[PDB]
Each structure stands twice: as structure tokens, then as C-alpha cells.
Amino acid sequence: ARSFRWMQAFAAVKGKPTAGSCAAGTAVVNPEDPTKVTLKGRYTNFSLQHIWEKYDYLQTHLLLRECMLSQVAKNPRLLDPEINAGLTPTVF
Amino acid sequence: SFAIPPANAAALADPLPATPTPPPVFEAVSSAALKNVEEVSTMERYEAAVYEESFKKPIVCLFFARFSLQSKVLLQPFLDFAASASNNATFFLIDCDRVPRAAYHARVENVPSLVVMKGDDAFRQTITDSVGVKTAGDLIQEARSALDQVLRLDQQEGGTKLQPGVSSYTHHIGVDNLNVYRKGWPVA
Amino acid sequence: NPPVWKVNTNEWLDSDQYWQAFVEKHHFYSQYQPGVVDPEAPQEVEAFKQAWHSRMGKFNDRSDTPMLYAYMNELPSWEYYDLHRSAFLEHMTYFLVRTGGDFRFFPEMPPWQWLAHMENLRFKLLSVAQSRRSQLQLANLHGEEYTQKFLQYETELFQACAARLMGHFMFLCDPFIPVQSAEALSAVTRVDNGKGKLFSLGDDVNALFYLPEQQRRDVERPTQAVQTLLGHLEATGRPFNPCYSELLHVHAEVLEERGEHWLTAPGECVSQAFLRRLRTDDPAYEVYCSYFKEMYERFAGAKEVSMEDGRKRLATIEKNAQEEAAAYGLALKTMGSAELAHKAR
Amino acid sequence: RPGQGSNAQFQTSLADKTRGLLGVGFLRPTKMASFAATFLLNF
Amino acid sequence: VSFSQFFDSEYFWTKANVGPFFLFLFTSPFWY
Amino acid sequence: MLNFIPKRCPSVSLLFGKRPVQRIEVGQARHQLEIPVETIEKIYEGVDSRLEYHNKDYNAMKWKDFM
Amino acid sequence: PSGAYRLPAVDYKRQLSRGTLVEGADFYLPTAQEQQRLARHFEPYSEQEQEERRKFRFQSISVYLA
Amino acid sequence: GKIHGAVWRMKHLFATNFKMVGHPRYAYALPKNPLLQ
Amino acid sequence: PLGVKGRSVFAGMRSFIGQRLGRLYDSFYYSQSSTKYVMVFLFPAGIFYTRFRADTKLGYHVFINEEKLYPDYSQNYFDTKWTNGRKVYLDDETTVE
Numbered sequence: 020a021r022s023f024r025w026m027q028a029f030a031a032v033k034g035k036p037t038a039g040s041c042a043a044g045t046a047v048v049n050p051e052d053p054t055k056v057t058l059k060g061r062y063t064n065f066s067l068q069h070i071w072e073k074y075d076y077l078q079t080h081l082l083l084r085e086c087m088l089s090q091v092a093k094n095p096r097l098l099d100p101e102i103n104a105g106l107t108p109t110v111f
Numbered sequence: 112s113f114a115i116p117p118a119n120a121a122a123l124a125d126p127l128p129a130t131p132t133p134p135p136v137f138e139a140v141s142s143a144a145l146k147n148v149e150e151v152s153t154m155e156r157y158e159a160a161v162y163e164e165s166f167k168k169p170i171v172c173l174f175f176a177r178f179s180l181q182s183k184v185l186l187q188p189f190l191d192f193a194a195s196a197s198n199n200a201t202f203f204l205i206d207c208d209r210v211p212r213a214a215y216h217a218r219v220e221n222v223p224s225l226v227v228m229k230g231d232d233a234f235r236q237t238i239t240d241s242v243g244v245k246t247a248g249d250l251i252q253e254a255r256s257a258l259d260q261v262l263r264l265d266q267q268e269g270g271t272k273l274q275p276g277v278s279s280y281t282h283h284i285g286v287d288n289l290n291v292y293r294k295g296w297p298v299a
Numbered sequence: 300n301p302p303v304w305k306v307n308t309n310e311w312l313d314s315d316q317y318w319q320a321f322v323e324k325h326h327f328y329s330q331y332q333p334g335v336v337d338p339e340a341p342q343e344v345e346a347f348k349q350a351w352h353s354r355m356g357k358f359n360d361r362s363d364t365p366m367l368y369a370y371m372n373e374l375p376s377w378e379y380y381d382l383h384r385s386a387f388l389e390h391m392t393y394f395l396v397r398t399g400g401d402f403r404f405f406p407e408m409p410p411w412q413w414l415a416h417m418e419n420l421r422f423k424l425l426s427v428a429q430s431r432r433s434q435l436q437l438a439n440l441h442g443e444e445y446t447q448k449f450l451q452y453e454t455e456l457f458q459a460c461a462a463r464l465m466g467h468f469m470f471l472c473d474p475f476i477p478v479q480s481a482e483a484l485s486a487v488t489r490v491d492n493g494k495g496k497l498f499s500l501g502d503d504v505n506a507l508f509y510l511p512e513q514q515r516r517d518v519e520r521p522t523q524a525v526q527t528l529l530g531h532l533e534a535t536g537r538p539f540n541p542c543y544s545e546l547l548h549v550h551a552e553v554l555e556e557r558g559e560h561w562l563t564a565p566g567e568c569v570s571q572a573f574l575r576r577l578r579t580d581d582p583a584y585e586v587y588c589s590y591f592k593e594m595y596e597r598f599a600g601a602k603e604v605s606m607e608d609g610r611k612r613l614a615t616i617e618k619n620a621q622e623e624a625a626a627y628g629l630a631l632k633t634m635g636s637a638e639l640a641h642k643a644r
Numbered sequence: 645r646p647g648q649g650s651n652a653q654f655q656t657s658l659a660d661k662t663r664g665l666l667g668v669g670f671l672r673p674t675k676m677a678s679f680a681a682t683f684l685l686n687f
Numbered sequence: 688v689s690f691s692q693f694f695d696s697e698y699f700w701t702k703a704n705v706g707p708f709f710l711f712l713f714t715s716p717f718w719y
Numbered sequence: 720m721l722n723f724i725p726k727r728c729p730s731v732s733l734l735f736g737k738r739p740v741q742r743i744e745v746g747q748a749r750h751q752l753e754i755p756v757e758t759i760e761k762i763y764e765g766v767d768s769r770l771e772y773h774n775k776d777y778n779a780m781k782w783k784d785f786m
Numbered sequence: 787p788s789g790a791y792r793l794p795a796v797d798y799k800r801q802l803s804r805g806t807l808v809e810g811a812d813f814y815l816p817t818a819q820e821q822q823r824l825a826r827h828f829e830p831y832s833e834q835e836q837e838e839r840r841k842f843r844f845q846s847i848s849v850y851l852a
Numbered sequence: 853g854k855i856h857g858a859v860w861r862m863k864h865l866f867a868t869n870f871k872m873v874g875h876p877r878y879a880y881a882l883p884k885n886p887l888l889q
Numbered sequence: 890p891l892g893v894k895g896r897s898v899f900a901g902m903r904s905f906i907g908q909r910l911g912r913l914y915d916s917f918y919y920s921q922s923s924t925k926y927v928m929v930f931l932f933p934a935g936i937f938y939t940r941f942r943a944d945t946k947l948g949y950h951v952f953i954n955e956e957k958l959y960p961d962y963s964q965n966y967f968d969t970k971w972t973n974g975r976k977v978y979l980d981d982e983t984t985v986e
């Protein structure tokens with residue numbers, strides 16, 4: 020249960036919106052000096068948000084994969100719980 | 112009919128927050144200002160550079176981002192190149208998420224990117240590895256060659272032969288429409 | 300004053316120097332502004348903006364009444380990826396893996412090298428899958444939804460594993476190596492050939508960590524990692540399916556394409572690399588930061604424990620760990636998705 | 645090197661590179677003729 | 688005034704009178 | 720208000736400065752208000768006589784003062 | 787191509803995603819003297835400019851005729 | 853004629869307001885009221 | 890600031906022409922192979938040939954009195970048969986033979 024503290028923490032933040040479904044920036048003009056204008060936000064060279072809003076999770080997913088690979092190069096016995104539970108596709 | 116929602120609190124949040132730092136045991140691994148460059152934090156500073164210093168003597172700008180490992184690898188040799196050649200050029204260090212309008216200006220599409228600039232369009236050479244074949248030394252060699260080229264061309268023909276091009280009349284408005292405010296044009 | 304409707308219009312405008320400038324701005328510097336009293340007002344501004352967007356859409360969009368969409372044989376990036384959603388996914392996973400990067404830097408047009416590599420990997424996968432199907436599927440006698448389900452289930456699985464490991468501070472601990480059994484202790488001690496140390500945390504941490512020597516605190520190549528994993532799995536007698544194994548191998552290959560520094564910088568640790576590459580818009584950003592803060596402040600004060608003190612401890616750790624792993628299946632029904640639940644059943 | 649693993653796979657035949665020089669599957673004169681026909685018919 | 692210093696950009700665009708030059712340029716077909 | 724100051728000549732405004740006070744009706748209720756003729760004469764220092772409108776019976780002030 | 791002579795603009799969709807697009811001002815005002823007129827409020831036009839403008843209160847039918 | 857109509861409406865709608873000394877989009881440039889606090 | 894000292898308007902013209910040509914090469918490169926070659930070489934070339942021939946050479950409408958005098962065009966392709974009224978372009982030195 021306290022081991023699944025972190026599962027509860029993850030499930031808490033589930034459908035919170037991201038920058039992948041919207042524009043990455045917005046302009047604000049200084050009202051006292053309209054010549055002055057600031058861009059609040061991030062960089063982006065990307066405009067296919069109407070597609071990426073569905074696969075937004077893949078970046079962190081692939082990061083997690085690369086990190087599981089790093090951990091497993093040292094110890095491959097960390098997945099045995101899930102293998103025994105039968106979540107993965109395995110042919111006993 | 113095409114639209115994108117305006118923005119979100121996440122998008123407008125701080126792109127560069129702080130993260131925890133480890134104790135001095137994780138640092139112990141097998142593989143274990145700067146007085147010559149300028150870290151740029153503001154599009155005001157970037158514009159001042161590009162429109163005055165880049166007309167006086169050339170500039171070399173490194174556009175990076177924190178997520179990239181190639182930037183971390185390329186940082187130190189870039190600092191050595193700066194320490195070598197700061198007499199002939201100025202050297203700047205820009206983060207794309209902190210100053211995106213500088214990245215849109217230089218037309219950078221991938222990170223890390225070197226940009227050699229003189230006259231703001233008289234000489235603009237972008238060096239990068241869109242494929243993933245080059246290395247940091249290759250990038251620095253290309254940057255040295257480009258810097259030599261632009262210096263030679265500025266000396267060529269009595270200081271002339273390096274005049275600005277399309278920015279003479281475009282003002283980078285097709286690249287970034289927010290320059291209309293700088294030019295004072297209406298938006299009504 | 301006289302009545303303003305009795306007053307001559309040009310005389311009023313000659314008297315007034317401000318609204319002179321207002322008229323020059325809209326009717327001398329332009330020829331197409333409307334003849335309304337206030338052209339700068341919000342209704343006019345928003346009408347102009349909507350007209351702008353509608354005009355550009357009608358001109359550029361792919362529609363049943365196309366103006367510019369015509370004589371199309373080689374499509375641009377946006378239309379190509381909008382029509383071919385299969386290729387957007389493939390071209391995007393390759394970009395994130397070949398270059399550890401954000402979707403915000405997704406290139407307009409990919410390189411031919413990347414495309415050719417994709418076709419070669421497609422050759423490999425289709426060969427293996429076709430030969431498997433030929434062998435087994437015949438002796439018996441919508442891809443978008445399937446791909447979506449597969450990826451959702453996979454990210455849920457890896458998230459659950461990461462949470463399970465963070466429960467005991469085993470998620471991303473390097474140069475440390477976690478151990479829950481004497482067999483694994485011997486196996487990971489064979490790395491440093493018996494050198495190094497072993498560290499412990501008291502009875503809330505249900506595993507013991509091992510520090511190799513600084514010269515052997517390196518990370519291994521992903522192909523070696525996959526080979527080690529698969530060899531261990533076949534030694535235990537639980538081999539993955541061939542399609543999944545090929546998937547792992549191609550992932551390792553595209554990771555090898557990164558080169559020498561594929562995950563970490565020289566003076567960098569894996570936790571720092573994870574926090575570096577982690578999307579800041581991610582909902583779990585604060586969760587991971589919390590975990591790594593706690594892990595750092597615990598490992599700073601972790602105590603050292605020699606070899607034989609652990610094995611007797613590793614027995615009870617194995618016991619309560621298998622008990623927790625048994626509880627895990629029920630715990631997935633608590634908050635895990637219906638996919639995870641049905642696959643546990 | 646980073647990309648040497650991928651750039652080793654790119655080795656072609658003489659006939660392959662002749663075919664690429666000529667642009668067999670990338671010029672498409674039938675497509676050019678179809679374009680010309682459609683363009684003239686659109687008058 | 689010399690050819691060179693006339694056709695120098697600064698003198699050409701600031702101090703010179705380019706009216707006759709550009710009128711000759713426009714009426715070139717008539718002269719030809 | 721408009722920048723139309725009546726000429727104080729008697730051919731236009733009969734009896735301007737014959738007395739030391741001016742009066743006006745204000746608003747829909749037409750409230751009375753009395754104003755000193757010197758306070759009013761302060762305007763004719765800013766008045767510009769080149770400009771004359773509305774049958775050449777009204778001059779214009781300078782824009783600085785009017786604004 | 788090198789990239790020196792590239793297209794000096796960015797597509798409107800990418801600008802819209804960047805939060806950079808501006809739609810307005812089919813017209814423009816070249817000079818700052820002409821830009822700041824509606825904000826000055828006290829000298830929208832200099833005096834010399836005022837007397838120069840006073841010469842064009844009406845169109846010249848005489849000049850039209852000639 | 854368009855310009856004539858525009859000015860003819862501007863007269864009636866701006867010349868007797870007491871609230872439009874200029875256009876509201878440029879009110880930042882005005883001096884500040886001493887009576888507000 | 891219009892113009893710079895030491896630089897010539899002819900040098901600026903050369904600069905401008907270089908810019909235009911480089912931009913044209915870039916736009917031709919980043920274009921469809923299906924359309925650009927046709928629209929840039931084959932229609933211009935055909936139009937040039939036709940207009941030059943018409944505006945420069947001089948042509949004649951040829952007729953024949955009898956069908957027995959018609960030529961044999963069975964073998965040559967794209968014209969299997971004679972038709973009267975054919976426009977025929979000739980050179981100034983051409984004779985009746």
C-alpha cells in the first residue's frame with residue numbers, strides 16, 4: 020500500500036493538460052508602450068497538435084523505456100514481479 | 112478551417128524550473144560568465160547585439176536546450192573556441208525556451224546550433240547536425256572555417272561587400288510578425 | 300457653440316486637429332477601410348481577424364472546393380502527416396529515439412537517411428512477423444486502434460513498474476545497484492569481481508544497494524542490456540515473443556545510433572539525465588522531483604553494511620518482496636486501468 | 645561514430661546508382677503528361 | 688564631378704540630382 | 720465642445736463687455752451660471768484670428784489651449 | 787541549396803502555434819511623426835504642417851480644368 | 853462620399869461627448885487626473 | 890541611411906541579381922518534379938518556337954487539285970493522309986522544285 024503510494028500519486032495527475040494540445044506562446048503588448056511586446060511561452064517548430072494530442076505520452080514513455088534498459092543492464096530481475104503477474108506477453 | 116487553442120497555464124509556465132541536485136557520491140563516476148562569452152536572457156539584449164555588435168564585428172551564437180545531451184557535450188569546446196577567438200568576434204549563449212524570439216530570428220530548427228552572424232544578414236551561416244552524424248569537433252571546425260571566411264570577406268574590398276540583404280526591407284516580419292510593433296506600424 | 304448639425308463639416312474638421320489625424324490614418328493611408336465612425340473599435344478588429352482566418356483557410360485548406368490544393372503529387376509535411384497518420388507516428392518515434400529530443404523540435408521534412416533506416420527496420424519486422432504467421436497461424440487450418448491500445452497499455456505498464464520501484468527507492472539508483480536476493484547479489488558482484496561496497500536502509504527500504512568501483516560505475520550499451528535481459532529470461536525459462544524481442548532490438552539499434560554518449564554526459568548520473576530529458580509540461584514532473592529529492596536525502600545518509608550481514612537479511616527481503624509482488628496483482632485492480640486488470644486476470 | 649551503423653547499410657550497386665541518376669521512380673514522365681493534360685483541360 | 692564619385696552610392700542617393708539621368712534612361716527608346 | 724469662439728465685436732456679439740459678467744444656461748434643466756468677463760477674456764489671448772468660421776462670426780483657439 | 791537564399795518567412799500555421807502571428811494593418815505609417823499623432827494629443831501636426839495643410843481644404847477645380 | 857459620411861458621423865458622435873478628447877486606444881498617453889486617488 | 894561610401898550602384902545591382910537567382914534556384918529545388926520541369930522548360934520552349942517561327946518565317950496554305958496527285962503518307966507516322974489547306978513554313982531561298 021505504502022509501496023503503491025507512488026501509484027496513487029501518478030493516478031492523481033492523469034488528465035491535466037499540456038503544451039501539446041495548444042500553442043506554445045502568446046504575445047502581450049505593453050499598454051503604456053505599444054512598441055514593446057513580450058512573448059510568453061516556449062519554443063516550437065511544431066504545428067500538428069491536432070494529432071499529437073493523442074500521443075502526448077510517448078516522449079516520457081520512451082524515456083522510461085531507456086531508463087528501464089539502463090537499470091536492467093545491471094539487474095534484470097526487477098521485472099520478474101510483472102512477468103510472474105502475467106502482464107507482459109510471455110510464453111512460459 | 113484551421114485553429115489552435117490560444118495557450119495553457121502549462122505552456123505559459125516557467126520552461127526552465129529548478130530540479131534537485133545530488134550529493135557528492137552520484138557525481139563520482141568513471142567518466143568524471145566564463146570570461147569569454149555572454150549568456151543571453153532577453154530579446155532586448157539579443158536585438159542590441161544583432162543590430163549593433165554584429166555590424167561592428169561578427170558574432171557567434173550557440174542556441175541550446177537543456178534536454179539535449181549534444182549541447183552539454185558541445186558547451187566546453189565552444190568555450191575553448193571562444194577563449195581562442197574572442198579577439199576577432201563576440202560569443203553568445205542562448206537557450207531556446209528562455210528566448211524563443213532569438214531562435215525564430217536565427218531560423219534554427221534543431222539544437223544545438225551554431226550561428227555566425229555579421230550585419231544581421233550580410234553573412235549568416237548556421238551549423239548543425241540534423242542527421243546525427245557529426246560531432247562537437249566537427250561543428251567547431253565548421254565554425255572556425257565560417258568565422259575565417261566572414262573575416263576575410265569583411266576585409267575584402269575596403270570593408271564593403273558585406274551589406275544586409277532582405278532584412279533591409281523585411282525586418283524579419285514574415286519570420287516573426289511581432290516586429291511590426293518594433294517598426295511602429297499599426298495593428299488595427 | 301452653435302448646433303453641431305448646423306455647423307459645416309469641413310469647418311469643424313478644420314477647427315479640430317486631432318480627428319484630422321484620425322481620418323488621414325484610415326482614409327489617406329488606406330483605401331479599403333470601412334466608412335464607419337470608429338474603424339479601430341473591437342468589433343471591427345475582431346471582424347477583420349475572422350475574415351483574415353476564413354480567407355486564408357478557404358485559400359489553403361484541403362476541401363471539397365479547393366483553390367490552391369490542386370496538381371498534388373508530392374505533398375508537403377503538414378498535409379502528408381495529416382493524411383498519413385501511420386507515417387507521422389513512425390517518423391516521430393524515430394526522431395525522439397535517434398535524437399533524445401522534444402516533439403517541439405520535430406523537423407519539417409525528415410532526412411533520407413532516417414527514411415532508409417526506417418525501411419530497413421520495416422524489412423526486419425515484416426520478415427519476422429510474416430515467417431511467424433506462415434508457420435503457426437495457418438497450421439490452425441483497423442491498425443490505428445490496435446496501435447493506440449498497445450501504446451497505452453505499455454506506458455501504463457512502465458508507469459506502474461516505475462511506481463513500484465520508487466516505492467522502495469529502486470527506480471533510478473545509479474551508480475548504486477539494487478538487490479533483493481543473494482543470487483542477484485552474486486550476479487552484480489561478479490561485475491566488479493567482488494570489489495566495491497554494499498549499503499542498506501532500515502526496514503522501510505526492502506532491498507540493499509551495491510556500489511561498484513569508480514572505474515566500473517559506467518553505463519552499458521543498450522544492445523548489451525537487451526542481450527543480458529533476454530539471456531536471463533531464457534535461463535529462467537520465460538522468453539518474450541519474437542515480435543517483442545525484435546521491437547526491443549530495433550529500439551536498441553536506434554539508441555546505438557546516438558553514439559558514444561547515448562544517455563548520459565561524462566560527469567552525469569542517470570537520475571540527472573532523466574530530470575534533464577523530462578518534459579516540464581509533464582503532470583508527473585513534481586512527482587518525480589519529490590521522489591528524487593527524497594532519494595538523494597536518504598542515500599546521503601545511508602549506512603554501509605558488509606557482505607554476510609545482508610544475505611541473512613536478503614532472505615527475509617525475498618520473503619516480504621514475494622509477498623508484496625503477490626499483493627501487487629490485487630493492487631492493480633485498485634487503481635490500474637481495466638486493461639491492466641484484465642491482463643492480470 | 646553515431647551514425648556509422650546506419651551509413652554502413654547505404655551501399656549501392658552500379659545499376660542502382662545509374663537508375664537513381666536517371667530517376668526512374670522519381671521523375672514520372674507519365675505524371676508530367678497527366679499534369680500537362682489536366683492543366684490544358686482546365687482552360 | 689567625376690563618373691566614379693557621381694555613381695558612388697552615398698553621393699548618388701543623397702547629394703546628386705539623378706533627374707536627368709533617369710529621364711534619359713526612360714527615354715532611351717526614343718533616342719535609339 | 721467645439722473650437723468655435725464667438726467674435727466679441729458688436730456686429731456679432733452685441734453687448735459683450737458692457738457689463739462685468741456673463742451668464743449661461745446649462746443642461747436639460749438649464750441651470751444658471753455666472754462667469755466673470757475676465758475669466759472669459761482669458762480665452763481671447765489663445766484665440767487665433769487667421770481662422771474664422773460659420774459666417775466669419777467664430778474664431779478658433781490654438782489647439783494647445785483648447786485641449 | 788545552402789540556405790542563404792531561403793524563403794524569408796514562416797508559414798502562418800507555425801506562427802500561430804508559436805503565438806507570433808499578427809493579422810492587422812493592411813496599411814502602415816512610415817514615419818514616427820505620423821505614427822505618434824493620435825498619442826501626442828497636443829501637437830498632432832506641427833505649425834508648419836498645419837499651415838501647409840490649410841492650403842488643401844478644398845480640391846482645385848481650376849487645376850482640374852487646366 | 854465614404855469619407856464624407858465617416859466625418860459627418862464623427863462630428864455628431866465625437867464633438868459633444870466630453871469623454872472623447874481623443875481615441876480610447878491612446879488614453880495611456882494622456883496626463884493623469886489630480887482628482888483621482 | 891541610403892547608400893554606403895566606397896560601394897557602387899552597379900555592385901548593388903550585381904548583389905540583387907545574385908539574390909534573385911539564388912532564390913529562384915531554391916524555389917525550383919523545393920518544388921514538385923511533376924509540374925516544374927514542364928511549366929519551366931517545355932511550355933516556354935514550345936511557345937518560343939511557335940512564336941519565333943510565326944513572327945520570323947513566312948508560310949503558305951497548300952492545296953492539291955486531285956486526289957490522284959496526293960502524296961503517299963501511309964508509312965510516316967502522325968500523318969497517314971494528306972489534307973488540303975496545310976500550313977507550310979518555308980525559307981526565303983526555297984524554290985518550287
Ligand SMILES: CCCCCCCCCCCCCCCCCC(=O)OC[C@H](COP(=O)([O-])OCC(O)COP(=O)([O-])OC[C@@H](COC(=O)CCCCCCCCCCCCCCCCC)OC(=O)CCCCCCCCCCCCCCCCC)OC(=O)CCCCCCCCCCCCCCCCC
Pocket residue numbers: 713715716719
Ligand atoms: C519579372 C517581374 C515583373 C517585373 C516588372 C517590373 C515593372 C517594370 C517593367 C518595365 C515596364 C515596361 C514593360 C512593358 C511591357 C513589355 C512589352 C513592351 O512594352 O515592349 C514591347 C516592344 C516590342 O513589342 P512589338 O510588338 O514588337 O512592337 C514593335 C514596335 O517597334 C514597338 O516599338 P516602338 O516603335 O513603338 O517604340 C517604343 C518601343 C521601342 O522599344 C525599344 O526600342 C527597345 C530598345 C530600347 C533600347 C534603348 C537603349 C538602352 C540601352 C540599354 C540599357 C540597359 C538595359 C539593360 C537590360 C534591361 C534593364 C531593365 O518601346 C516601348 O514601347 C516602351 C518599352 C520600354 C519602356 C521602358 C521600360 C524599360 C524596362 C525597365 C524595367 C525596370 C525594372 C524591371 C524590374 C527588374 C526586376 C527587379 O518592346 C521592344 O521593342 C523590345 C523590348 C526590348 C528587348 C531587348 C532586350 C532583349 C534581351 C536580349 C538582348 C541581348 C542582351 C541582353 C541579354 C541578357 C544579358 C545577360
Ligand SMILES: CCCCCCCCCCCCCCCCCC(=O)OC[C@H](COP(=O)([O-])OCC(O)COP(=O)([O-])OC[C@@H](COC(=O)CCCCCCCCCCCCCCCCC)OC(=O)CCCCCCCCCCCCCCCCC)OC(=O)CCCCCCCCCCCCCCCCC
Pocket residue numbers: 710842844845846847849850
Ligand atoms: C494625356 C494623358 C491623359 C490620358 C490618360 C489618363 C490617365 C489619368 C487618369 C486620371 C483619371 C481620374 C479621373 C478624374 C478625377 C477628377 C478628380 C480630381 O482630379 O480632383 C481634382 C484635382 C485637383 O487636385 P487638388 O486636390 O486640388 O491638389 C492640387 C494642389 O492644390 C496643387 O498643388 P500641389 O502641391 O498638390 O502640386 C502642384 C501641381 C504639381 O506638383 C508640384 O507640386 C510641382 C511639380 C510638378 C511638375 C511635375 C510634372 C508632371 C509630370 C510631367 C508632365 C510634363 C510632360 C512630361 C515631359 C516628359 C519629359 C520631357 O499639382 C499637379 O500638377 C497635379 C498632378 C496631376 C496628377 C493627376 C492625378 C491622377 C492620379 C493618377 C495618375 C495615373 C498615372 C499612373 C502613374 C504612373 C504613370 C507612369 O484635379 C487634378 O489635379 C487632376 C487633373 C486630372 C485631369 C485628367 C483628365 C481626365 C478626365 C476625367 C473626367 C471624367 C471623364 C469622363 C469623360 C466625359 C466628359 C464629359
Ligand SMILES: CCCCCCCCCCCCCCCCCC(=O)OC[C@H](COP(=O)([O-])OCC(O)COP(=O)([O-])OC[C@@H](COC(=O)CCCCCCCCCCCCCCCCC)OC(=O)CCCCCCCCCCCCCCCCC)OC(=O)CCCCCCCCCCCCCCCCC
Pocket residue numbers: 277793794901902905909912913916929930933
Ligand atoms: C530561356 C528559358 C526561359 C525560362 C526561364 C529561364 C530562367 C530565366 C530567369 C527567370 C525567368 C522567370 C521569372 C519569373 C519571375 C516572376 C514569377 C516567378 O516565377 O517567381 C517565383 C519566385 C518564387 O516565388 P515564391 O517562392 O512563392 O515567393 C518568394 C519571394 O518571391 C521571395 O522574394 P524576396 O522576399 O526575396 O524579395 C521580395 C521580392 C518580391 O517578389 C515577389 O515575391 C513578388 C514579385 C511581384 C511580381 C509581379 C509584379 C508585377 C507588377 C506589375 C508591374 C507594374 C509596374 C508599373 C511601372 C510604372 C512605372 C513608370 O522582391 C523582388 O525581388 C521583386 C523585384 C521585381 C518586382 C518589380 C516590381 C516593380 C518595382 C520596381 C523596383 C525597382 C527595381 C528593383 C530594385 C532593386 C535593385 C535593382 O519568385 C522569386 O523567386 C523572386 C521574385 C522574382 C522577381 C523577378 C526575378 C527576375 C526575373 C527576370 C525576368 C526576365 C525574363 C526575360 C529573359 C530574357 C529573354 C530575352
Ligand SMILES: CCCCCCCCCCCCCCCCCC(=O)OC[C@H](COP(=O)([O-])OCC[N+](C)(C)C)OC(=O)CCCCCCCCCCCCCCCCC
Pocket residue numbers: 274275279712713890891892893896897898899900901902904905
Ligand atoms: C527604364 C524604365 C524604368 C521604368 C519602370 C521602373 C520604375 C522607374 C524607377 C526606376 C526603376 C529602378 C528603381 C530602383 C530602386 C532600387 C534602389 C536600391 O537602392 O536598390 C538596392 C540596391 C542594392 O544596394 P546594396 O545592397 O548593394 O547597398 C546598400 C545597402 N542598403 C540598402 C542596406 C543601404 O541599390 C543599388 O545599388 C542601386 C540599385 C538601383 C539601380 C538599378 C535600377 C534597377 C532597374 C533596372 C532593373 C534591371 C537590373 C539589371 C540592370 C542591368 C544593367 C546592364
Ligand SMILES: CCCCCCCCCCCCCCCCCC(=O)OC[C@H](COP(=O)([O-])OCC[N+](C)(C)C)OC(=O)CCCCCCCCCCCCCCCCC
Pocket residue numbers: 367368369370371913914916917918919920921922924925928929
Ligand atoms: C502588364 C503586365 C502585367 C502583368 C505582370 C507581368 C510580369 C509578372 C507576371 C507573372 C505571373 C505568372 C507567374 C507564374 C510563375 C509560374 C512559374 C512556376 O511557379 O513554376 C511552377 C513551379 C511549381 O512548383 P510546385 O508544383 O511545387 O507548387 C506550385 C503550386 N502548387 C503547390 C499549388 C502546385 O513553381 C516553382 O516552384 C518554381 C518557380 C521558381 C522558378 C521559376 C522558373 C525559373 C527557374 C530557373 C532556375 C532553373 C534551375 C535549373 C536547375 C536544374 C537542376 C535542379
Ligand SMILES: CCCCCCCCCCCCO[C@@H]1O[C@H](CO)[C@@H](O[C@H]2O[C@H](CO)[C@@H](O)[C@H](O)[C@H]2O)[C@H](O)[C@H]1O
Pocket residue numbers: 710713714715716717
Ligand atoms: C512626375 C514624375 C514623372 C517622372 C517620369 C517622367 C517620364 C518621362 C518619359 C515620358 C516622355 C516621353 O516618353 C517617350 O515619348 C515618345 C513619344 O510619346 C515615345 O517615342 C516613341 O513614339 C514616338 C512617336 O511615334 C516615336 O517618335 C519614337 O520613335 C518612339 O520611340 C517614347 O517611347 C517614350 O519613351
Ligand SMILES: CCCCCCCCCCCCO[C@@H]1O[C@H](CO)[C@@H](O[C@H]2O[C@H](CO)[C@@H](O)[C@H](O)[C@H]2O)[C@H](O)[C@H]1O
Pocket residue numbers: 945946980981982
Ligand atoms: C542571349 C542572347 C539571345 C538573343 C536572342 C537571339 C535570337 C535567338 C534565336 C536565333 C535563331 C537563329 O536561327 C535562324 O533564324 C533564321 C530566321 O528564322 C532562319 O533563317 C531563315 O529566315 C531568314 C530570314 O528570311 C533567312 O536567313 C532565311 O529565310 C532562312 O534561313 C535560320 O534558318 C535559323 O537558323
